[PDB]
RNA sequence: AUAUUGGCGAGAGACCGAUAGCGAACAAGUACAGUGAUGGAAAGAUGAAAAGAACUUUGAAAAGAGAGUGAAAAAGUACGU
RNA sequence: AUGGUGAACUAUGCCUGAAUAGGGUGAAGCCAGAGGAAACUCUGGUGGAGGCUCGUAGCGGUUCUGACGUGCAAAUCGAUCGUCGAAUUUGGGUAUAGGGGCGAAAGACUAAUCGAACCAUCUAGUAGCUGGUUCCUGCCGAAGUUUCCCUCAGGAUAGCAG
RNA sequence: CGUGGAGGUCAGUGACGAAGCCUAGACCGUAAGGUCGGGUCGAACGGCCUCUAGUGCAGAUCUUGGUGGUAGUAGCAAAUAUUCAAAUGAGAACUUUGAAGACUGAAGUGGGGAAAGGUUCCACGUCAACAGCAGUUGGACGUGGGUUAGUCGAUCCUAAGAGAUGGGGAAGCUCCGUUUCAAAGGCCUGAUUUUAUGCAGGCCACCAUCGAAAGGGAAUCCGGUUAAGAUUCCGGAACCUGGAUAUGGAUUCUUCACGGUAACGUAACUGAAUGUGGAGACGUCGGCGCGAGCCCUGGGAGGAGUUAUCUUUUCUUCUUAACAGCUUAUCACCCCGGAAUUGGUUUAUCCGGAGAUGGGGUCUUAUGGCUGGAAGAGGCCAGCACCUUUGCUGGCUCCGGUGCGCUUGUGACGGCCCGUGAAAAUCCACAGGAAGGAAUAGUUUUCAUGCCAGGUCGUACUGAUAACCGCAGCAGGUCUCCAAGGUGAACAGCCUCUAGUUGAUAGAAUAAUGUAGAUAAGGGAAGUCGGCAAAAUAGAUCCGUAACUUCGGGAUAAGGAUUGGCUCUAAGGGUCGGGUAGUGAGGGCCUUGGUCAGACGCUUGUUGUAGACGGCCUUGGUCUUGCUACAAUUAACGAUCAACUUAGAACUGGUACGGACAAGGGGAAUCUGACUGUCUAAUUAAAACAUAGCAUUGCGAUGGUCAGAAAGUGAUGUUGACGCAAU
RNA sequence: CUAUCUAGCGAAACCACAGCCAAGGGAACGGGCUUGGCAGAAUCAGCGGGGAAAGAAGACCCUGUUGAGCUUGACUCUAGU
RNA sequence: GCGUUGGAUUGUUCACCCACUAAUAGGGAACGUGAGCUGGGUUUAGACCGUCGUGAGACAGGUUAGUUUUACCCUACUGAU
RNA sequence: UGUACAACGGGGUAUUGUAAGCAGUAGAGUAGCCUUGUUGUUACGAUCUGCUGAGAUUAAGCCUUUGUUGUCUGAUUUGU
């Protein structure tokens, strides 16, 4: 909201590096059951809510 | 090719809008390779990006209109659609008149 | 407009993040969060909600502290070094 | 000597077998909805072993037809029957 | 019934700021002139008042009972509308909370819900009242009648039946 | 009969193949069902004597999941818009570029933000999925980059309010109050030379903390630079705060300054406790004056456009910041002077013996002017050639004018009130006199200069008929600054310049019935419950206007006459000048000589150029004047300048003229609410509520009304009968 | 501008099974029962009679020994005084 | 077989008048006809007056304001292949 | 391969209402000037007149046409 806080800033910078895809090396381990990332968010479809 | 980035780029280094921005398509094989300001600037002074002067909006009608009324023409009562306050009121007459009598008589 | 048009008058904010739990629950204007309750000094638990309760007793984090008891009785609390048997 | 669906460590059953059994056999108090107290699922079984398809051809490719792998792909990952 | 959450929507108060083209009408006060003996009275200028007025921005919505009515829309669109510098419109902070708040009252509003909020527990609340009530064959096989009951869309007793 | 499991048995069946599934193939039983053959398929299962139960299915607007007909149908129709060519690409109504045609028309379909969103911002590559058509395009996909602060804000203060102590309640979670029944604190001088900082006195008493990134607030701007950043980065130029130390100046044996009669001034020109004062600090509306930005426009220096004909034509550049020196206004005040024959004076009538008019000065410095910053900056143009990385040489960047013009700021005012329209932090000043001080120098760090540091957090983008909220990219809602030209009263409608889009499925005929616009000969509300919908007048100027009334209104009542274009007429202002002859300056003194700053400019010197043709003196023809004269005055005149407003006269047009847009139907009455206003946000806007007015009631606080579970608790109450409370 | 046709996209409402009538009886105004009339693919655009069409286990009436809001010289209590 | 009207009042069925005309006859079809229309009346909720009730409220009382939705199905009908 | 057809053009019919340009001692008049006038012309001047009873349009569902140019064999289906 352009004049943020550390605390809301945090948050956002968590969000960015956990806004990424598997590394394909994940599929190819042993006994993988991991096909997804269930846990992708984005900014249309849902909302942080901080 | 896309060039939307260059007509954007070729905006803000000549410093008119996008409507003003000439980007011809017979040299266009080079265009696509400027992807920076001082590309861009270079290919200004050649003369591949000219500045596509103003539109003009010649005021010769008003010119020729103004002076109409000025000599006394269009002054009946259809030309008017405001009252006789409106157009001048009668506190600015009146004030007009005064400050003339006021420095008249201290003169 | 009680529906549609009256739901985008709304661009405040009632709760905020709680320094305590994180759960955005801290009610700004009452300054307590609702899920667990802060400043107070004691995490509100009521009996009438159990599933609010299993979602925060012990086991929900890390136990950083008392995964370490068990082991540390299961042995008597010892103290010191160890020594050399063989090999 | 008495009680103890909480915590740890174990042994069991004419119990349930994954639309059942705890909400959760799975990155389950997870995704998600609600400004909030709260609510809250779906999801197991390719094959012994990826050996999960070299290479030929068509197509822009996605793919197809062969070939090949594999007992068997009427087992080819949108995979027991 | 118990225990918690909610005024970011709207209801009211406070603190803090913000917004309201252009015309009409014309009050005091003032100036000059005229009349008359006085009292005082008329004429002509300013003057801008006035919870006034026509009318944009804004706020509501009267009518077409128009459009749509499995819609752009859980109430919107078009025309026609009332008001528009004030008991005006509104942002932010804050205060008031469930049989309690707030109400220029309509039992109106209380975050699509309210002549009585939302959530969880008691709770699988109770129902003389509707609905459903899961294989075959063989044998026997009825009643809507007596008496009592705040009893007559129900029971108990006797009867019919196995 | 059958289903899940348990005990026993058939040394039961079985990967040369169990279970499961399919099978208008066969057999048995009346039936519940059982057996076999074939195909499919790969790990367990069956008969019998018994035991056990979460044991049977068609529906309970039954639970979960899936699929149908409807159906390739309804529909993908608001926001006036598309077309051609090339490029890329396997694949263009949609991507890009170019050329047209349009729209938003600057209360944007433009530029920035608050809340909100959180990487949507930018680059590369890319189309399985989303963009209800498509798509090599994207606010999508995979990978990366990007947010720079002593000055902008948060930080700090406090408002309404929240709330911790001491306390009082409450079994208690906790409730009351927050300065009240609390002995609640640090602080300058001196001691110094173990005193580190204690100690001996002068002292003051406030009395937690939080609480408004549009309330108060110490300090900065310009040029330029990225794919995405800037008042933050580069360059240049500033100012503020905290601290340390000097240099320079003033002060002084009249030891802590002078001048002016005065308002006050001069860069500095001692000074504590305590007290006082100012700023912060501030209602709304109306007109007027002035300033800035913009608008209009003349001359000149350049460029671009038209040029069948005409146009000294049209458009465009000509700009200057924060900060600093000098200077500049209303208002206000000071010295002389003294007033009626009252006078000054604003658009708006206030002021004057509590002392005017007049003459002379002081002050705040908003603003404005010259200069520095700073023209070496930016802008408009000509030559040079660099696949390039790029620059050099260069010219101008100038002088004006007007205005009820719009926006905005400010000043002196006036109107309004039973509303007169915030607090604190902080900063400064005055009274006071403690304390210390001279020249052999002591102060002076609120005089000039010099030195150091300014920590943390935010800075990207949207801000909306695709970035926020409405399950969605949903015609809905969401706060605010800037805003041009013309017609026009106008921020109205309509067209355009800057800027931005050209976006929301398309192609062809374009039946009925529709939705939205319209037009209809004669009559005309005969239609309908009701003229409901449409229609007419509807701008401006002149004439004219009744019943009634609370005398203010009704009333643009009702009802009449004109409106275009060309050529004219008249009226409405500003600024300057009220003489001749001799005389002094003709403070321009140009002109003739040069005297010598007459010099730069065109590494010493050669000798070449101008002296910038200019300080300094002239014998001079070189339109302002003090003195005398005629006699000085009337009539008032003459010269320049640029605005619109009003009225009138002829002519003219197939009698058209508010020609498009824009824009009141009117009158006689009746019922009822006095009026302005308010409510059933999503079927009732009303004669309903409210309002002023009137009347009644309770109450003199050891109280009246009301709250709380208590309280050493509260609301009225920061109140007092002209008040509060209930009607 | 739709509706119409075409290129692409592509639901829902509803659905005992389906859909030609007269008369009769019948739960006493059925498309299917009976008696007669009649009946020839596949369909397209309108239309509105009908399918007692669709939307909700009628907001009207009654019953229930079912409630709720309000009122009071109903009954029983109660904070306050 | 054919024709049986135009208007004032009332929501009006009904009724009473004006007038023409040859005449202004009675009726049925779910008291024909609202997925044909209107919403004037009765019929939710706002509000006023009169009577009744101590009251909240009651009245064929009188009056004003009061969102009326879907066919993209089958048959029937109207046209077409 | 036809006094065929089509597109242009021509003529007719019709709607319309008298243009573009030039010229005019037409024009309410307005002012400069020079030989200063017995129309003095220059500049402006709504409008009017003469060619212009014209100009434009004339078929998309008007009529005719020997004129110029151009076209005349693609696919599918059918038997007692």
């Known amino acids: 909201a352009a004049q943020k806080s550390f605390r809301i800033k945090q948050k956002m910078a968590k969000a960015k590096k956990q806004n990424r895809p598997l590394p394909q090396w994940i599929r190819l381990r042993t006994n993988n059951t991991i096909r997804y990332n269930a846990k992708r968010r984005n ?8 | 090719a896309n060039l939307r980035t260059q007509k954007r780029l070729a905006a803000s280094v000549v410093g008119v809008g996008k409507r003003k921005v000439w980007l011809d398509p017979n040299e266009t094989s080079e265009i696509a390779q400027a992807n920076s300001r001082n590309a861009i600037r270079k290919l200004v002074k050649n003369g591949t990006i000219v500045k596509k002067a103003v539109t003009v909006h010649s005021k010769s009608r008003t010119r020729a ?35 003339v009598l006021r420095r008249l008589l201290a003169k | ?13 009632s709760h905020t993040l709680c320094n305590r ?8 204007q009452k300054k307590t969060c609702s899920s667990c309750g802060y400043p107070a000094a004691k995490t509100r638990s009521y009996n009438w909600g159990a599933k609010a309760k299993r979602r925060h007793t012990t086991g929900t984090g890390r136990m950083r502290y008392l995964k370490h008891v068990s082991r540390r009785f299961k042995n008597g609390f010892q103290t010191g ?3 050399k048997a063989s090999a």
């Open chain 2, 65 to 99: 209109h103004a002076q109409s009324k000025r000599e006394g023409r269009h002054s009946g009562y259809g030309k008017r659609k405001g009252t006789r306050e409106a157009r001048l009121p009668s506190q600015v007459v009146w004030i007009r008149r005064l400050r």
């Open chain 3, 81 to 83: 070094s160890a020594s």
């Open chain 3, 21 to 28: 739990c994180g759960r955005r629950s801290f009610h700004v």
């Open chain 3, 1 to 13: 407009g009680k529906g549609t048009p009256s739901f985008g008058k709304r661009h405040n904010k």
């Open chain 1, 43 to 50: 900014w249309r479809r849902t909302k942080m809510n901080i």
